[PDB]
Amino acid sequence: HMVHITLDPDTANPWLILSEDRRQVRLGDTQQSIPGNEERFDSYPMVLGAQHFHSGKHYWEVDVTGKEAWDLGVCRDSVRRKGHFLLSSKSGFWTIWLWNKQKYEAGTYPQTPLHLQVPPCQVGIFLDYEAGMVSFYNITDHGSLIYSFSECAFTGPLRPFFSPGFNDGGKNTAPLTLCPL
Amino acid sequence: HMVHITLDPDTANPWLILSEDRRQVRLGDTQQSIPGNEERFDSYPMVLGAQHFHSGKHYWEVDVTGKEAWDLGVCRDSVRRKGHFLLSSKSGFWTIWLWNKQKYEAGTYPQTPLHLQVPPCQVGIFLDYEAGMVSFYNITDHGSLIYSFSECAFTGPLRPFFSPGFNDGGKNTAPLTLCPL
Amino acid sequence: GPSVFLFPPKPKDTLMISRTPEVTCVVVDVSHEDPEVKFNWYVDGVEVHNAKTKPREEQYNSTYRVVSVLTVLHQDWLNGKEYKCKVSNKALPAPIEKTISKAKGQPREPQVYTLPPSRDELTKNQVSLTCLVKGFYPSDIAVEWESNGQPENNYKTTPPVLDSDGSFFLYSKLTVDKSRWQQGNVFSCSVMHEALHNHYTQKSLSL
Amino acid sequence: GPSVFLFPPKPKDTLMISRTPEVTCVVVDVSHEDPEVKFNWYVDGVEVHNAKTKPREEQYNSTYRVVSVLTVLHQDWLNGKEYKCKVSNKALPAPIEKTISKAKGQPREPQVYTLPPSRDELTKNQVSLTCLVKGFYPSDIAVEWESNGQPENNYKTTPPVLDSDGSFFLYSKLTVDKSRWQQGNVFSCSVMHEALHNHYTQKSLSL
Numbered sequence A, B: 001h002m003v004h005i006t007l008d009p010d011t012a013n014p015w016l017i018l019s020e021d022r023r024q025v026r027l028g029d030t031q032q033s034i035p036g037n038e039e040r041f042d043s044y045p046m047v048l049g050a051q052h053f054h055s056g057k058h059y060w061e062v063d064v065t066g067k068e069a070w071d072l073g074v075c076r077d078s079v080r081r082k083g084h085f086l087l088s089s090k091s092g093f094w095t096i097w098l099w100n101k102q103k104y105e106a107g108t109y110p111q112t113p114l115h116l117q118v119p120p121c122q123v124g125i126f127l128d129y130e131a132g133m134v135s136f137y138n139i140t141d142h143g144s145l146i147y148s149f150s151e152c153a154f155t156g157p158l159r160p161f162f163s164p165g166f167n168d169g170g171k172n173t174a175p176l177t178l179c180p181l
Numbered sequence C, D: 001g002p003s004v005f006l007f008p009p010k011p012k013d014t015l016m017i018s019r020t021p022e023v024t025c026v027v028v029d030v031s032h033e034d035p036e037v038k039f040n041w042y043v044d045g046v047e048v049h050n051a052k053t054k055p056r057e058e059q060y061n062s063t064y065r066v067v068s069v070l071t072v073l074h075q076d077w078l079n080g081k082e083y084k085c086k087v088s089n090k091a092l093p094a095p096i097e098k099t100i101s102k103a104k105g106q107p108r109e110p111q112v113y114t115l116p117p118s119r120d121e122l123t124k125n126q127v128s129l130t131c132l133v134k135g136f137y138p139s140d141i142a143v144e145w146e147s148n149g150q151p152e153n154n155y156k157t158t159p160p161v162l163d164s165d166g167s168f169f170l171y172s173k174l175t176v177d178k179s180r181w182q183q184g185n186v187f188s189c190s191v192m193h194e195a196l197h198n199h200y201t202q203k204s205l206s207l
Ligand SMILES: *[C@@H]1O[C@H](CO)[C@@H](O[C@@H]2O[C@H](CO)[C@@H](O[C@@H]3O[C@H](CO[C@H]4O[C@H](CO)[C@@H](O)[C@H](O)[C@@H]4O[C@@H]4O[C@H](CO)[C@@H](O[C@@H]5O[C@H](CO)[C@H](O)[C@H](O)[C@H]5O)[C@H](O)[C@H]4NC(C)=O)[C@@H](O)[C@H](O[C@H]4O[C@H](CO)[C@@H](O)[C@H](O)[C@@H]4O)[C@@H]3O)[C@H](O)[C@H]2NC(C)=O)[C@H](O)[C@H]1NC(C)=O
Pocket: C003, C005, C007, C008, C009, C010, C021, C022, C023, C024, C026, C028, C029, C059, C060, C061, C063
């Protein structure tokens, strides 16, 4: 069920630096000067994957080694790109994230804390369109399940979501890397 | 049903000046040095009348000519005397009052506004213990009723209440005078 | 020569009957050389004598700071009477007069509302009770909290904030234990203000 | 000779991506006689050149006030890096160096609660929506309101007030028409803060 994903350079916030293969993303310290198209996140270090999902089972992995914050997930293609907003399952977002080094949360509203005895170095995101499901796996810990959203409905196209996080604390400059699968 | 009432010197706040006959009261500009007994109001220009009511019909009048503020009524003998509090019928007080020159109000909780086309110069206070009632009359306007408390219950002793008001605006220095009846 | 500043009472004091409001008349540096100060106080130009002189204070400047304190009657201050402090001293040729009084402005009635804790807070072990007080003028006010006739002192009160109509609002937060809130206990927000009937009102808050 | 003061960015600006935070280097009076100022700017001792010089301003003193402005990256300020302004001028013998940075203190997460109007208010024709925001450190914060994706600008926000634990709290009052509240409309309180996930959160309030 694995899927090769590439980061969509039109979604990408201007402080992000994507790699030439479009398979890594990091938050850099200058703002790149680039089009202000509708598709682009203007207030957070976030980026979409190129793929659009309409049906099917899709699975991919992301590497978060060494990082103190990030966000990962799938989202509606209709999510809003301009301004501040919450990552919430009522709002088009099926994500989980790490911030403040060490705090893990699932993006339910209100939010759900996660206790991970083994901090993931990689995370697998699995999407099952018809089952109405998105699950997350801690690959470092034998693939154990971290969290699963269910009865998501799903009407339209879904896109993979990514964010390398903010660099509070100065020790979050690594990038997310999509694993070769 | 008329009743000759005298102001009780033990209730009286120390800023009040009672008259020698104990039938007038005004708010003076020095504090009289006098006992701190339990019966005495310590934080408002208030005074009880000497009578204690256990039953019966009782009626008296008070003159408010020229005043911009006062309070009148009956109360439980048990009302608290020390500190701040509200004049409220839930709290042992069946009073109406005038403040701010021109604003009349009934001491229900919350408070009830009163519209008086003829500003009273005297007010009659009638108490009917068994009927559980306290009524007010605008003697200047033929005795018209201003306001009536009912179903007051009444278990204990009741005392007539008086206060010449605060002197906001500087033109409230006249006294209350009990009417000869 | 010697300088003089006149000061108003602290605002709450003019409303708390349990407080005593004082106008202060500060004289700064009077010479070690000629150190004695006369104070004369007038209330609406009428001479008064109940004023308290404080013992002079030596300043690192090698100079004298001299204070006289004058207690004021609450209603006098509220009713806008003028308090004059006239200083006399030989390090100086002519007596200096300073006058102060309460600020002008038509007073407006505070509206008081108590708001219980948000249900989201009931997961923490202390909860916040709020008293919104608004529409009041001037800013001089006093707020306090009580439960069952005893005062509750675990509260903090924002300063008054100017609103779009030129009136003031503030909020008061009382933090209490969740078990006290949850049991059904009655809390009360209390407000003293020039423009209230009898200068005082209170509102309850319970579950 | 010439004096110099260094100034920090306005706090909200370091948190609003739509704002631009600047450190200001002020030089006061430089003589009409020898008026030209050199500014050098270092960020963590490393020389930078993007700084904006402002045209000199004539002072009633018959003197020159000279500013240079340096824009900072948000995360740079937040991450506590040091910003040095070195002034050079001939009304002066040796270059003066000033350094500033963000203040120390372990940041704490704001807790946000929205409280509806008290039912006593629903007799007036405008009502007050409250956002309590508490437990946060430092005091640098930004609060705003929105309804249905459009901003609501009829709001006032108390300054942050220190609590008993050393954290801050404030309240934000949004005034609205009672008919908008009554109809069932959804309002939102928004908060931006260093110690929030993605530095932002929001809470709803409806009937
Ligand atoms: C020798 O050294 C001395 C002292 O170090 C110098 O003293 C100074 O002289 C200055 C004049 O040359 C003078 O400047 C004025 O300052 C005042 C504000 O001062 C207040 O705050 C200062 C701290 O910032 C303190 O120094 C003072 O204590 C003062 O505090 C207030 O004092 C009130 C009096 O006690 C007090 O009110 C009472 O409060 C009590 C409770 O205790 C009661 O409730 C009572 O009822 C009240 O009446 C206040 O609580 C208190 N407030 C607070 C929070 O501090 C300033 O207002 C004034 O400003 C006006 O005037 C100037 C020009 O005239 C103008 O520029 C202004 O904009 C404005 O119009 C003055 O600038 C200093 O006050 C004084 N310092 C002291 C300690 O008094 C000498 O000058 C030195 N001499 C030489 C030769 O160098």
